[PDB]
Write an enzyme that holds these catalytic residues in place. Structure first.
Site, short mmCIF file in Angstrom:
data_model
loop_
_atom_site.label_atom_id
_atom_site.label_comp_id
_atom_site.label_asym_id
_atom_site.label_seq_id
_atom_site.Cartn_x
_atom_site.Cartn_y
_atom_site.Cartn_z
N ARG A 68 -24.06 -4.49 63.04
CA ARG A 68 -24.48 -5.58 62.20
C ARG A 68 -25.80 -6.24 62.62
O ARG A 68 -26.67 -6.54 61.74
CB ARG A 68 -23.28 -6.62 62.63
CG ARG A 68 -22.80 -7.67 61.51
CD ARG A 68 -23.75 -8.72 61.00
NE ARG A 68 -23.45 -9.67 60.38
CZ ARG A 68 -22.85 -9.81 59.18
NH1 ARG A 68 -22.58 -8.62 58.46
NH2 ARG A 68 -22.18 -10.72 58.69
N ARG A 121 -13.63 -16.33 42.60
CA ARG A 121 -12.81 -15.28 42.69
C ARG A 121 -11.45 -15.65 42.99
O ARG A 121 -10.28 -15.45 42.32
CB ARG A 121 -13.24 -13.94 43.51
CG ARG A 121 -14.59 -13.36 43.20
CD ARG A 121 -14.81 -12.03 43.33
NE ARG A 121 -15.29 -11.94 44.65
CZ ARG A 121 -16.33 -10.98 45.15
NH1 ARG A 121 -16.91 -10.19 44.22
NH2 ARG A 121 -16.67 -10.96 46.38
N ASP A 158 -16.71 -15.91 46.29
CA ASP A 158 -15.70 -15.93 46.98
C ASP A 158 -14.50 -16.84 46.26
O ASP A 158 -13.53 -16.81 45.99
CB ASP A 158 -15.74 -15.75 48.65
CG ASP A 158 -16.55 -14.75 48.94
OD1 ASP A 158 -16.01 -13.57 48.57
OD2 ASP A 158 -17.51 -15.02 49.74
N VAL A 173 -27.90 -7.11 40.79
CA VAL A 173 -27.89 -8.34 40.89
C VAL A 173 -28.94 -9.43 40.34
O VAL A 173 -28.66 -10.00 39.43
CB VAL A 173 -27.68 -8.76 42.50
CG1 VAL A 173 -27.69 -10.24 42.68
CG2 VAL A 173 -26.47 -8.36 42.92
N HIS A 186 -19.63 -15.79 54.66
CA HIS A 186 -19.49 -14.87 53.64
C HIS A 186 -19.05 -13.55 54.23
O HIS A 186 -19.95 -13.09 54.94
CB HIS A 186 -20.42 -14.65 52.53
CG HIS A 186 -20.34 -13.64 51.70
ND1 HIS A 186 -19.30 -13.84 50.83
CD2 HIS A 186 -20.78 -12.58 51.29
CE1 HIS A 186 -19.15 -12.58 50.16
NE2 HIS A 186 -20.15 -11.81 50.42
#
Lengths: 313, 307, 313, 307
Positions: free
Chosen positions: C89, C152, C149, C15, C176
């Protein structure tokens, strides 16, 4: 921090107008303040230029005043009083100085401490005059000098050889004007010298080459005779220089820069390839000139120095 | 009319994928078909690339088959398998399986070869395809030259776009720097040194040495190299698709130049919509000429042996 | 004055690497310092990225350290510790915080006082964490949030209707991740609502549309399953945001911004269309959501708030 | 292959010349031929434009003749002479002397009309040429829309590229603002006002009024207007030459849309390499629909009378 590049443009003629438009289309700087005696033109131009924005990156474009130069990165001077018929070179200089002082002093008084980019004619003379009236360092006062002459010289050589002008490398030096000259010695196409190119393509008569510079030297007269004025070239060169400064590129460009021994000259601004960036002029390139070319430079400089001397007295 | 530029990319490795990204970002061409043995990889890659499209001009990007090269403007080959003569023969077979099915598709645009050994495979491509000499191009020393210029630029602190120097001959060990014509703003290196004696002559020597071993050093640091060639390839593409008549160092066919013949080797050349238009023959010094001669010689050797 | 835009990149993964490359190709900023635990990668990448420079505008690219952020305009955080299998998480968040603190504190200590652009996952959570560890204003800490997102989602709608995605306008909002949702209510193609588009093109089943978002929601899993990782999309979104800031555009973009009442939320960073410029977040757009969509936002926020609460304690 | 985009520009006034400059600067197309009664003017202009080329991609620029439109990809008409019905007939004769000799050249690319009255002349061009409906395009309300968006953008302080609003109908007095769908970042104007009540409803009213009289005010200030349309035209060109499938407000043929037929009028449309692909029919409110109806009506009136 605040990354907001502001440009103040003095002179909303075809050159200034086009310059601004070139800045808009390429998205250079985020603000342009247009200053000109004719307030209405500037106002109508700022609107027309902004009409174009939704098709490019955003900007703030408005009719401005000299005080708006307070926090400007750049100040572009473009509309010198034209030489009337029967007017002497020295008188053209003197009438512009009174005008120049009236622009430089109040901009300097606004607090402005960026870079002066001068395009007004006579450019080399007014560059030096701008440096003298502003007091700014020698490297923070730049004149467009022979950037356009050089571009015109490259496009010309490119057309003859049918190659992208960006693969052609040649300069026009000296004072912008009649006394300028081609630096054939170091001119090349993709690294291949002109001489070398000719000695591999004999069809290129030394006559065509001689006429080629003659045409660049007189390019402005031809275009003016045809369309009445010239502006796309200089506007494009101006945006190029602006980009080099605003993007801190350290790009080599033919500009009018203070002379301190280079070419055997001193205390005058004259055209020469130089490295420019966010802080103005860095390295002043000094092409080892041919004896004949050095003479052409000497002659160009001398003539300009005399006028400059008489000018300030 | 039919203003639709199509590119077919063969080889979806770091080089191929990076090249595709560069085309997306600069908005070069309107369609890109990616051909590769790993269909899943190319499918995930075309999706990943398409995800960037709303931030640039639109394109059609997808996993492709050689047959898709039928109406492509350009075919870019990056698929090159890792004795030199052995390396060549194993690539000559892979290259054949690429070129033949692409020519059978009906393709008659331009071939841009980037797979190593580039100069050899560039020649092999020309022979396998039957295409005209000026329609098979190799990246050759384009990247070496860029690296060479960036190195000079950092030394002198000048935008590389204002630096002009070449790396010539076969891309590899035998390549050499054409110092006689290298310049900065038209100001010769020799002349630049006179004005700036701080630049030691041996620093210049290391500089090219570092360029010749550039790939080695990079691979040692990050594992692989691709941003350079990817950018170079995209540069070569903009030159063709925009019909620029730009001067770039590419692997082109020799027909007398430098006293060479029947080989593709690196040298400055004018390129445009129809491929190579003119081959720039720089007047090399005696020193440089030999370098050029030897590089050619050893390359012609393998070439003949390989075939 | 000195117009030199400097960007510090933390994380040299696919990235970060790609982001930098996108910056190079488009000529954004004049300097990029790459910081990463693996000093060799950064060093080898800076060289490879610079090899590309002679084909674009110049830059200074090097392996850097946190202190090099002293005078940076921007700091881009991109490589969060991935969620191991069987890890909760909350534990993913906690292991990243220790890492985040180790990045933010020393950058803040370098003197740096620009804008934080966070891309690390979980992005919304780490954005808020970055704001909390840095102390910087709420509008000077930005997370990439749902920009990709959203892109896309637009490219998807564009492919279906065969229109340039830049003429398609639709958002994906919320946190997100799994709990994000499509803002169909205000989605349009050239101003023509989706609903309106469907009620003029009945061939578009409500099934295709429902599956279309489902696919955007799971886009990352599909690509990872195929090519093993995802990076071009986010890198491109990151360069877009950088451009908007560095060029002071006041562009509207889906980003993760502090919540102060919008959508009925408070004290959490979550995805929403916002106006950003040289000074960070200006106007936080608040699309009048559908009851169902408002619920989706509430649910997304709530879940994120709980984790965030537990995280800081 | 033949990757060479060619543009023929008719009319070398401030609009035509400014448009050419915009093509040079953005590097759109590789060739530009400028046709105009004043050969000297066009010659000095092509030289002045070419002088900028070394700072951008290369192009071939020159004073041209209609016959040069033979293999042009695009023909841009800006030559429009200054009763409405009279204005039309004097332009219908000039337009014929342009279109016919260009069609006789062999031209079969796309016609882009920018001469006023644009919508009428767009229709006239279509009839005089015989070309397919989707291959004759008019700038219509492209510029009005841009001005409309820039105005909203300044009010709200948001990049106009994040503002979406149209100006529709025939370019002129009867054009209207499609407020029902105008938005900022997808956030409706109506909704934007609720969140920002400082924006008075009458300020919105003046805003469009200022857009409708935009040309008048500018001409009053600087004598003429051209940077806007020049930029719009270059935008329309990039959409065609790059085959973008972009949505732009253009004058297109009506075949049912908004209940209209047999006229070119302004409305959002998808455009690409082959001209108009889809006509976006926005669901106008009753108010806006009437505006659209009346604008069409008065335009159809003149149209019929003119012919």
């Amino acid at each position: 921090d605040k990354d907001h590049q502001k440009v103040i443009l003095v002179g909303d003629g075809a050159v200034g107008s086009s310059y601004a438009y070139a800045m808009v289309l390429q998205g250079i700087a985020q603000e342009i303040g247009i200053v000109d005696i004719f307030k209405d033109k500037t106002k109508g131009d700022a609107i027309d230029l902004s009409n174009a924005l939704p098709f490019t990156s955003p900007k703030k474009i408005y009719s401005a005043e000299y005080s708006d130069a307070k926090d400007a990165d750049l100040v572009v001077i473009t509309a010198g009083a034209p030489q009337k018929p029967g007017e002497t070179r020295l008188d053209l200089v003197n009438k512009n100085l009174k005008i120049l002082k009236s622009i430089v002093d109040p901009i300097v008084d606004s607090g402005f401490n960026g870079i002066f980019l001068v395009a007004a004619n006579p450019v080399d003379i007014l560059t030096y005059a701008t440096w003298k009236l502003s007091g700014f360092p020698k490297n923070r006062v730049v004149g467009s000098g022979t950037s356009l002459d050089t571009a015109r010289f490259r496009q010309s050589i490119a057309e003859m050889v049918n190659v992208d002008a960006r693969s052609v490398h040649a300069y026009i030096m000296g004072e912008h004007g009649d006394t300028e000259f081609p630096v054939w010695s170091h001119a090349n196409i993709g690294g291949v010298t002109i001489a070398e190119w000719v000695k591999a393509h004999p069809e290129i008569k030394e006559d065509k080459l001689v006429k080629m510079f003659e045409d660049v030297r007189d390019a402005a007269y031809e275009i003016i005779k045809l369309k009445g004025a010239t502006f796309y070239g200089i506007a494009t060169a101006l945006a190029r220089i602006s980009k080099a400064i605003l993007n801190d590129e350290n790009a080599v460009l033919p500009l009018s820069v203070y002379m301190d021994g280079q070419y055997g000259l001193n205390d005058i601004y004259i055209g020469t390839p130089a490295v420019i960036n966010r802080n103005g002029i860095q390295n002043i390139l000094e092409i080892p000139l041919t004896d004949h070319e050095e003479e052409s430079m000497q002659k160009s400089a001398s003539q300009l120095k005399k006028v400059l001397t008489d000018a300030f007295a």
